[PDB]
Amino acid sequence: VAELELDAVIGFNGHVPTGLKCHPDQEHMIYPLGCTVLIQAINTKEQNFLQGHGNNVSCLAISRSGEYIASGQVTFMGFKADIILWDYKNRELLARLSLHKGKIEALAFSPNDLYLVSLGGPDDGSVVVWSIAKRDAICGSPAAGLNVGNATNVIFSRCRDEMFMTAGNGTIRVWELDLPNRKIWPTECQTGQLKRIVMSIGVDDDDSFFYLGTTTGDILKMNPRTKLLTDVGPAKDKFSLGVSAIRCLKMGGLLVGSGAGLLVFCKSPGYKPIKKIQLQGGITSITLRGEGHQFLVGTEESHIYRVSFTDFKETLIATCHFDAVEDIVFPFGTAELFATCAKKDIRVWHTSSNRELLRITVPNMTCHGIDFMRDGKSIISAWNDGKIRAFAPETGRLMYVINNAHRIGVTAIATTSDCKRVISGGGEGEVRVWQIGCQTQKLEEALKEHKSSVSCIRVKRNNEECVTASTDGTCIIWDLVRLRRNQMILANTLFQCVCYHPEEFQIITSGTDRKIAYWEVFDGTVIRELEGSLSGSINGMDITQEGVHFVTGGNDHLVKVWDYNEGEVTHVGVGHSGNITRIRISPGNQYIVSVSADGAILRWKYPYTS
Amino acid sequence: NIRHWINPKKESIHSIQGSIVSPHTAATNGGYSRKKDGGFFST
Amino acid sequence: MRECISIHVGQAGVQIGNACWELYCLEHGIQPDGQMPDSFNTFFSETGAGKHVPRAVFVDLEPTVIDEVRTGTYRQLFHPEQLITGKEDAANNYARGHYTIGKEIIDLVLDRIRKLADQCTGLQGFLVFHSFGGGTGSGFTSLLMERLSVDYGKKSKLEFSIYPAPQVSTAVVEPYNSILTTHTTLEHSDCAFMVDNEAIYDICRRNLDIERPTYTNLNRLIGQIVSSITASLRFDGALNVDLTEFQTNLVPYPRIHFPLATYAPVISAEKAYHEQLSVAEITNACFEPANQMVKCDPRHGKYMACCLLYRGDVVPKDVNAAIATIKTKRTIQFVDWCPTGFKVGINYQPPTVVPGGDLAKVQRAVCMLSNTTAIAEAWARLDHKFDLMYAKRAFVHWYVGEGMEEGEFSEAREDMAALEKDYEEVGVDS
Amino acid sequence: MREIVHLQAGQCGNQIGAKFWEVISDEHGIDPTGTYHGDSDLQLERINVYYNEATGGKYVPRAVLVDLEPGTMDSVRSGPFGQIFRPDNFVFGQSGAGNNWAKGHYTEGAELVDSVLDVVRKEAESCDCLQGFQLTHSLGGGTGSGMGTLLISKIREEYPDRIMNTFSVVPSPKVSDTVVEPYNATLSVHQLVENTDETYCIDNEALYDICFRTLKLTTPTYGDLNHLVSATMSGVTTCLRFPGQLNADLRKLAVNMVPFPRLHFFMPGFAPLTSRGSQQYRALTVPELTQQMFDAKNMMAACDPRHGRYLTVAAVFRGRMSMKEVDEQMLNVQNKNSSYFVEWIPNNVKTAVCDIPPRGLKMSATFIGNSTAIQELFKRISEQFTAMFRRKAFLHWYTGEGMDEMEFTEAESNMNDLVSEYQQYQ
Amino acid sequence: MREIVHLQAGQCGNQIGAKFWEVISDEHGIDPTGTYHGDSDLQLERINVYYNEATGGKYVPRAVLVDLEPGTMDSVRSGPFGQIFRPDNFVFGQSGAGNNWAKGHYTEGAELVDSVLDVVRKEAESCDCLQGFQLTHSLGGGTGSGMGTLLISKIREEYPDRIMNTFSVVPSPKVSDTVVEPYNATLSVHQLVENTDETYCIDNEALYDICFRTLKLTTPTYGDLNHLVSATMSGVTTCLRFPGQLNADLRKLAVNMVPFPRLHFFMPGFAPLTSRGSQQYRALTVPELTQQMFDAKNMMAACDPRHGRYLTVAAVFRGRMSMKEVDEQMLNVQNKNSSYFVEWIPNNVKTAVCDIPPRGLKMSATFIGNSTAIQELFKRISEQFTAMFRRKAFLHWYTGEGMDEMEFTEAESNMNDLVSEYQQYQD
Numbered sequence A: 001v002a003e004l005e006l007d008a009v010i011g012f013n014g015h016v017p018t019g020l021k022c023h024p025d026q027e028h029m030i031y032p033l034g035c036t037v038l039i040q041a042i043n044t045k046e047q048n049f050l051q052g053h054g055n056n057v058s059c060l061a062i063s064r065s066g067e068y069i070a071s072g073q074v075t076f077m078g079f080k081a082d083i084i085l086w087d088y089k090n091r092e093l094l095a096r097l098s099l100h101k102g103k104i105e106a107l108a109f110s111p112n113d114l115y116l117v118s119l120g121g122p123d124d125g126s127v128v129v130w131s132i133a134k135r136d137a138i139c140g141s142p143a144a145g146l147n148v149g150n151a152t153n154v155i156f157s158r159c160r161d162e163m164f165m166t167a168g169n170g171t172i173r174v175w176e177l178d179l180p181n182r183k184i185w186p187t188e189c190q191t192g193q194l195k196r197i198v199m200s201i202g203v204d205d206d207d208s209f210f211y212l213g214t215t216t217g218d219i220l221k222m223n224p225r226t227k228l229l230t231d232v233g234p235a236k237d238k239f240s241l242g243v244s245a246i247r248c249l250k251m252g253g254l255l256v257g258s259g260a261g262l263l264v265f266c267k268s269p270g271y272k273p274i275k276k277i278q279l280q281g282g283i284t285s286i287t288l289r290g291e292g293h294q295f296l297v298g299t300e301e302s303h304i305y306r307v308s309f310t311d312f313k314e315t316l317i318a319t320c321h322f323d324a325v326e327d328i329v330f331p332f333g334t335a336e337l338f339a340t341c342a343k344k345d346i347r348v349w350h351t352s353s354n355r356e357l358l359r360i361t362v363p364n365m366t367c368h369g370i371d372f373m374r375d376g377k378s379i380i381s382a383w384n385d386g387k388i389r390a391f392a393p394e395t396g397r398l399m400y401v402i403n404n405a406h407r408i409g410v411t412a413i414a415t416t417s418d419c420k421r422v423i424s425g426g427g428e429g430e431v432r433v434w435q436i437g438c439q440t441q442k443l444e445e446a447l448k449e450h451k452s453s454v455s456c457i458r459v460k461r462n463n464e465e466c467v468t469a470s471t472d473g474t475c476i477i478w479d480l481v482r483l484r485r486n487q488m489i490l491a492n493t494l495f496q497c498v499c500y501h502p503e504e505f506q507i508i509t510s511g512t513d514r515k516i517a518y519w520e521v522f523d524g525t526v527i528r529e530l531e532g533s534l535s536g537s538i539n540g541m542d543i544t545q546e547g548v549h550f551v552t553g554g555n556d557h558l559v560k561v562w563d564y565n566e567g568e569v570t571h572v573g574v575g576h577s578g579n580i581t582r583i584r585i586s587p588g589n590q591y592i593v594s595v596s597a598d599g600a601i602l603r604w605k606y607p608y609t610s
Numbered sequence B: 001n002i003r004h005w006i007n008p009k010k011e012s013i014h015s016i017q018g019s020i021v022s023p024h025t026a027a028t029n030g031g032y033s034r035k036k037d038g039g040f041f042s043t
Numbered sequence C: 001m002r003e004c005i006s007i008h009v010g011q012a013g014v015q016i017g018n019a020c021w022e023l024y025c026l027e028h029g030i031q032p033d034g035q036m037p038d039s040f041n042t043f044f045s046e047t048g049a050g051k052h053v054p055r056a057v058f059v060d061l062e063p064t065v066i067d068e069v070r071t072g073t074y075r076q077l078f079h080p081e082q083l084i085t086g087k088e089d090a091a092n093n094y095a096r097g098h099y100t101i102g103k104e105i106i107d108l109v110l111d112r113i114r115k116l117a118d119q120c121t122g123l124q125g126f127l128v129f130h131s132f133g134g135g136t137g138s139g140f141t142s143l144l145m146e147r148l149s150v151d152y153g154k155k156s157k158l159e160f161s162i163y164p165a166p167q168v169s170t171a172v173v174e175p176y177n178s179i180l181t182t183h184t185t186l187e188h189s190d191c192a193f194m195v196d197n198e199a200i201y202d203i204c205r206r207n208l209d210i211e212r213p214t215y216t217n218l219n220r221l222i223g224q225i226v227s228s229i230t231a232s233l234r235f236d237g238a239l240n241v242d243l244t245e246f247q248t249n250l251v252p253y254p255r256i257h258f259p260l261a262t263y264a265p266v267i268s269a270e271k272a273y274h275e276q277l278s279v280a281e282i283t284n285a286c287f288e289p290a291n292q293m294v295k296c297d298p299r300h301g302k303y304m305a306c307c308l309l310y311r312g313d314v315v316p317k318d319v320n321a322a323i324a325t326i327k328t329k330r331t332i333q334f335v336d337w338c339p340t341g342f343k344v345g346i347n348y349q350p351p352t353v354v355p356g357g358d359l360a361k362v363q364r365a366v367c368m369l370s371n372t373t374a375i376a377e378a379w380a381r382l383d384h385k386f387d388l389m390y391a392k393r394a395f396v397h398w399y400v401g402e403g404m405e406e407g408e409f410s411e412a413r414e415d416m417a418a419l420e421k422d423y424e425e426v427g428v429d430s
Numbered sequence D: 001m002r003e004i005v006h007l008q009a010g011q012c013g014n015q016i017g018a019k020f021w022e023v024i025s026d027e028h029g030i031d032p033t034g035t036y037h038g039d040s041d042l043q044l045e046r047i048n049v050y051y052n053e054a055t056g057g058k059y060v061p062r063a064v065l066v067d068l069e070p071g072t073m074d075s076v077r078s079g080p081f082g083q084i085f086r087p088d089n090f091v092f093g094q095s096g097a098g099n100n101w102a103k104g105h106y107t108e109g110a111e112l113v114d115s116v117l118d119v120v121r122k123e124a125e126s127c128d129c130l131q132g133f134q135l136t137h138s139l140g141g142g143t144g145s146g147m148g149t150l151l152i153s154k155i156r157e158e159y160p161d162r163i164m165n166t167f168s169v170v171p172s173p174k175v176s177d178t179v180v181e182p183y184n185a186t187l188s189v190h191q192l193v194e195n196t197d198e199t200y201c202i203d204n205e206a207l208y209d210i211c212f213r214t215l216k217l218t219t220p221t222y223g224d225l226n227h228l229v230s231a232t233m234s235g236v237t238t239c240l241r242f243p244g245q246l247n248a249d250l251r252k253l254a255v256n257m258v259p260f261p262r263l264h265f266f267m268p269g270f271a272p273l274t275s276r277g278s279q280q281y282r283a284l285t286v287p288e289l290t291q292q293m294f295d296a297k298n299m300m301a302a303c304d305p306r307h308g309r310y311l312t313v314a315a316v317f318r319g320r321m322s323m324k325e326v327d328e329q330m331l332n333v334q335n336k337n338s339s340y341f342v343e344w345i346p347n348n349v350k351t352a353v354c355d356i357p358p359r360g361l362k363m364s365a366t367f368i369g370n371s372t373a374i375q376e377l378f379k380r381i382s383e384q385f386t387a388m389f390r391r392k393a394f395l396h397w398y399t400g401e402g403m404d405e406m407e408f409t410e411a412e413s414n415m416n417d418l419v420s421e422y423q424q425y426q
Numbered sequence E: 001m002r003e004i005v006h007l008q009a010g011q012c013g014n015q016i017g018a019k020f021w022e023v024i025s026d027e028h029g030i031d032p033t034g035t036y037h038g039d040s041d042l043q044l045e046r047i048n049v050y051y052n053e054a055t056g057g058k059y060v061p062r063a064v065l066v067d068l069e070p071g072t073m074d075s076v077r078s079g080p081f082g083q084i085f086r087p088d089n090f091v092f093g094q095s096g097a098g099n100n101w102a103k104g105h106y107t108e109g110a111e112l113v114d115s116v117l118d119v120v121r122k123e124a125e126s127c128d129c130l131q132g133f134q135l136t137h138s139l140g141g142g143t144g145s146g147m148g149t150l151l152i153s154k155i156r157e158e159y160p161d162r163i164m165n166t167f168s169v170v171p172s173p174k175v176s177d178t179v180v181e182p183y184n185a186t187l188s189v190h191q192l193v194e195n196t197d198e199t200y201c202i203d204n205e206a207l208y209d210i211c212f213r214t215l216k217l218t219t220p221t222y223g224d225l226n227h228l229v230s231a232t233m234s235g236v237t238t239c240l241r242f243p244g245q246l247n248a249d250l251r252k253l254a255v256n257m258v259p260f261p262r263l264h265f266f267m268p269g270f271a272p273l274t275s276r277g278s279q280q281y282r283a284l285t286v287p288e289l290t291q292q293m294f295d296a297k298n299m300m301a302a303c304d305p306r307h308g309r310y311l312t313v314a315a316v317f318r319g320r321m322s323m324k325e326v327d328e329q330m331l332n333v334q335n336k337n338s339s340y341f342v343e344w345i346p347n348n349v350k351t352a353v354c355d356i357p358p359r360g361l362k363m364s365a366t367f368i369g370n371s372t373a374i375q376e377l378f379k380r381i382s383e384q385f386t387a388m389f390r391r392k393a394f395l396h397w398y399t400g401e402g403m404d405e406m407e408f409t410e411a412e413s414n415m416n417d418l419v420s421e422y423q424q425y426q427d
């Protein structure tokens, strides 16, 4: 067994606030992605990733010297969540901080690497203060927000290592840490008659004023010396959807990012927009590089932008699906493109440089299964509303939409070789055939034997038979010419995938019972059963066109390469942060490209020449 | 450089016509509502 | 060349007709765009640009439901002026659809009928979809029938209305609006077919294998009966029965013209493969009390006349054997003055399947239109509600405050009394 | 295109209404800036019901904010949702009413209505087809009960052929926070029964009752107590703005709900109420929501529904669901609880279903209850007056502003008649 | 289809019941959260008997937790599977019962019964076909005995034609850990005899003697004694959740073992119990188990069967086995023990075989016995009450709250009425 190499990483988690942060060496950038955390070099584009965390991360904190990295996680109700220490240099976890029940909302580092502060989620609503040197230090828990709405954002002071503040829904409070007694004293600030809901906090270098970003569009300024509100936001032209991300420069002024996508450079008072630019989606992360001549903006549709401060010209960097990636397909005869579909979005990629080329947006619906036509003239995609759709490759024009195809929505779909038939699978158990005409789309027969979803459909090379994988536990081969089944395969497994051997005699199925089983199409009996994984189920499984090697993927984040006859693993690749669903070896056997349930696409080098 | 296509009708999740999904999983019902006089409903 | 005019009024008639007009498009190969890629002329009008438009009128004083069709899937099929909307509803008042708001828009409704009826080469009759319990479906049905019969003197009238169920009931002033319609539709209508909502809930459950039926399940199935009653005008068969005759051989007396309707076979996809669809079994399912589409017991009453509307691959030999079995049964009873009661109508076209429906692809079908005496039990149930509610004079000030007099409440009970006493006078054997 | 006019008077009405606009701007996706940002096109199709279009793509709510004291207008304008209101709909006097019904109706209240009715009549012409009026006030105070029921008498002399939706907070004995509540309560129900077609009474104890055991809240502040009223208040007209399988406007209810012209004092409710601990362990089904509505613990007024006979009941649904199960257990509950409902009115419940459930949820239900147990709400106010008028206490604050003592005997006389009508049918 | 509502009243029944929901969650493949993680589809295809499904594929149990002290209610929530329950089923008071029968039945528990019955009846209308109830308590104390028969009395008057499955730990002569213990038991047996269809007797000293002779346990803590009781707890209802060749429902067990309306106290049991050392020296057969059924050690009560006669005997099997060896082995044992079994009833043994054994063990069985020797458990309680009542000891607490002296003689007369009925049918 050998480690399977990985070529490139694309993906980003934009839902977390202030997810994108730049490490102080100005050559590396760290962003959250699923359960793990990833580091990308800006110049050399070399990837390094950190293994840990029970579930998806939710907060990030970087030291000013950068020699400690900390991040939180989310966990089910009634169970503790872990905060993990790290180093930038050797990338090893130091200790686990596992006190707050439920998710961690925010974290911060002291300027002199001496103290760390936390904030409990909506379950707890507490504050716990940590010092790095002992690696496990608890100061005190003052319950943070008192009566009225909880606090969400915590940041720590800039010049001194004593005071910190928490802001939230109608709550702002300034603490004060005393070193010998080890205590923090609440002092709730008074705002007059103003009650607002904050999303972001930015602190000046001189610690004179720190700003707030309200949902009403106003920008609030408060000074912790006097414990009184100091300024109010713009009297007119308030930003839409509030201020979702705020940032202040060293000299002065503010860099304001709104929830609509507006990026505004302004200085108090007045907050008038001097230089304006509009970015895609809600801005949730603004981070400076160096002294602020160049910086990065992270949005919530995973569109990371590179903005030059001297003229405000934006440069898009990375895109992915902000929801889980559902499917992947390769066009027949080529491997330089592949289309990945998810909720609300269908994309077309370039394989060599991971550069997007097309975006087809059907709003507010999810696209489960995608398949290509053999002539390459129409891209077939299943959807959740029950309507099969087909799209043009270049302009993305809707060629036809088929209404009321399935009762509980279309799950998986496959196309025939001569581009004249369409077979769809839905959650209601029906199997429907769709004859494609130049002006009509008809229904021939409905095959109702399944009583659960249809995970995947595979057709032969001679178009005489097709096979459907179901979460029922029944896998059926269909005679397409005469429209009736021949053999049924029964197991105590929720099947997730099925693939034909190139010689077309043998099929293999895998699912939740984690046994890769060899099957015969003559009678449906099982011959050999191999355990692909011992803890997590296997979802994605594909066979190359020669019949030598087949790969597997699943919840264990393991990219295994197998031998068909020997049935033993020869290559293992561990680079995923989320569960694998679909896998596809490229035509020509050049790459192994994998999808994840956290929105990341990973391309592995194919080891052998077969 | 990304060419982007927009569906004219921004449809909603709540206005979808079809059969109503059971609250229980299709494999096993949390509360057995059998068909009257024996059987199983389609799902 | 043979034409039919469809009128929709209320919320029920528009919502049923959304599931009725989705069927005619796929039967004749008509896209929702209105363009094909002479049997369609009974329901569609040819335009010189090769576009077909339906000959149906959608009327509702409430504008919430017609704005769904205008912005929905079928926005390019219907004519823009054949979608007539008011400003405000009738809100469970018969007077608000018959005296105040039903008076302002009645001239625009009757104007479009004259526009559609002029284009028809040969006009046969009217098919009107509404509900007895609503405010528009009871108000704006009543004076339209008062005005249509003045203009079109003797054209046939067929109503497909939603009867209130005996127990499952939605509105609160249901027994008032049921009585006040039948004082009009008894003499200004010639044959009123009835269905209800309870008896199609359970048929959707025992047969279709559906646990939770919506209104989308009911309106599709009533959309199949209307396409089966029309089927002789649309396609050729062994022997055809048209709209002129079976409205004259189902009405024996001028006051007793209230039949029922049922459809068979009604089988899901899984059950239909095992079960053998034979002509003897299909016509035996029609006469079972559990397959009635109206919550009534046909065994207590006696049938007056019957009609059979066959379809698909069916021969007339085994039909006559199938009728002979029914005549020898003892549970099915007939009244003595009708020794010949059955009708036979055969069409060569098989039933169609809708992509999105829940019925199976079958080889044949049938529809039955039965004139029984067991409906008098259903109306005696509802006039019981009228006497107990009117005894305390409840809800009367919402009626007199919008146009009518209180004396109409008593005299509408006199008509349903005389209607009820006529059923016992005819069902008694001589 | 069936527009609703919103009136907002008193101190309690100003707080609930300004948080009532907080919910229905979230459902339609309206920012506190003023622009529209939603994900569905069904919300923009009927946006003129509660909002007026303005230049720049911004919407301003059609509400009139009135109070004789500017002590709360600076609080509404300085809230999270205070920058959407029109700057010219803030009509205020300078001296407060001070918990007197006489100041709010004859001295302070007779001089500001010329500035109040001038804008209401101005906003009534901006509507294309006016549908009705709705008002938020409190019976236990001096401005809302004082001037609000003065506005009821004046608009009903101008627009007779309309509908009226008063959303009033009734006084409560255990949560009594003023000593002149029995005076200001009896002086508005003489005007409410005569010039209002449906009055939804809300109680302060029952809203605290729901926060204690249902949602399990230990600090039920006013910032979240008015949310529950705002949730029911946005469910009465969910079919007048959204499509559904059986639509119901405001006159759709009142024909089904009012058998006799002065039996229209209602009771409201909101169905999907759960805690945070029992959020994950809860089955969100149509049979589950039906049991929650007909429970005595989930009533929003301090009456026991078992002590009096229901006359007529609404059930307004939202969310994708089948009408069979809606019609199944709303047939059973008339039969199982046959003694609760009445025998001379069949089908006491009316079902109406929409297609859009609110944000943050998948279903909804709004309960409206006409019952004969509402007389016990008005019985305790009637017996508070008798022990207070006997000693003629607090009367010089009243007769020093314009009234005699004959109104006090007359208001109790019509209090006695209202409670007399409910007991006959019980 | 057939449903069981579970109730946990008293301190003794709460920790036994909280161990009961841990055993079946392991068999059904349910995590402590409530999300399914199992191997075979037979675990989930009958889960509605004990569980309710929540939104998102989560399963919650059908149990109602009640106790007058909230100290032991928070012991459950900190347990291994404490977070599976629902928080609306948590009903508790504020003041302790003091191990006083008149405090859990007349004074302090008489206000909570309005709050506990509105949530018991909540889970029953959501049910489709209710089979019966399952309550765990003990007869020694005042919380689980005074309130336990109060819950049974108020649930029969609502649901007359059902079956009660109460699981009562009985007082022990040598293991008395309460001084008013004879007073508590005789007051509760006044109701359980009259209005219960099945009552199991569990004795504490029998659980200890099994732990020292059979399992040879050095340290038998209370965490392990409840595991023997919970094994018999799951074996009774395994013909209601799993397929089997000879199925037998709970009311099937009602007709078989109850000949007369006042003889329904059964001694329970378990079958493959062995120590660690003798695993490899013992061979797994079905004729093994029959010789292990009638071990005087193996019953959960301190009533040796040779001081009585057997009325009806049942034994529910789990695993893969043939059926001739099942039924011939319960024919040979009656012929051998001819005098012990009664003569007026032929074929004293009812059998049952299932298809799913417990996890980790290839084959298992559960033993249920009805004998006339259980009068020794009831005579000594009648003797201990008699000497104490002769001098009216410990009585001024009970008589100060509402119930008088003559009620103690009423239950003592009924207690002596019952032990004659064992004797008169013995000979």
Ligand SMILES: Nc1nc2c(ncn2[C@@H]2O[C@H](COP(=O)(O)OP(=O)(O)OP(=O)(O)O)[C@@H](O)[C@H]2O)c(=O)[nH]1
Pocket (backbone or CB within 6 Å): C009, C010, C011, C012, C013, C015, C016, C061, C062, C089, C090, C091, C092, C093, C131, C133, C134, C135, C136, C137, C138, C162, C169, C170, C171, C196, C197, C215, C218, C219, D245, D246
């Ligand atoms: N089967 C079936 N019944 C319907 C449908 N739509 C409405 N109804 C029935 O119609 C009855 C009341 O009539 P409605 O149509 O709702 O009211 P209306 O006729 O529109 O009168 P207004 O609302 O005042 O305009 C209800 O009890 C429903 O049972 C439908 O689509 N299918």
Ligand SMILES: Nc1nc2c(ncn2[C@@H]2O[C@H](COP(=O)(O)OP(=O)(O)O)[C@@H](O)[C@H]2O)c(=O)[nH]1
Pocket (backbone or CB within 6 Å): D010, D011, D012, D013, D015, D016, D097, D098, D099, D138, D140, D141, D142, D143, D144, D145, D146, D169, D175, D176, D177, D178, D203, D204, D207, D222, D225, D226
């Ligand atoms: N539940 C609730 N009650 C309120 C609120 N605001 C005021 N009240 C009630 O209103 C009563 C006093 O009425 P008030 O507002 O002074 O009327 P006004 O004098 O005319 O302005 C008190 O008993 C409060 O209980 C609120 O936000 N929620």
Ligand SMILES: Nc1nc2c(ncn2[C@@H]2O[C@H](COP(=O)(O)OP(=O)(O)O)[C@@H](O)[C@H]2O)c(=O)[nH]1
Pocket (backbone or CB within 6 Å): E009, E010, E011, E012, E015, E016, E099, E138, E140, E141, E142, E143, E144, E145, E169, E175, E176, E177, E178, E204, E222, E225, E226
């Ligand atoms: N099996 C078992 N028995 C227990 C446990 N705790 C107490 N007991 C028994 O319960 C008896 C006393 O019952 P008691 O606790 O007073 O009942 P209560 O009044 O409901 O609290 C004692 O004789 C113990 O043997 C336990 O954890 N497991």
Ligand SMILES: [Mg+2]
Pocket (backbone or CB within 6 Å): C010, C011, C060, C062, C089, C134, C136
């Ligand atoms: Mg209508």
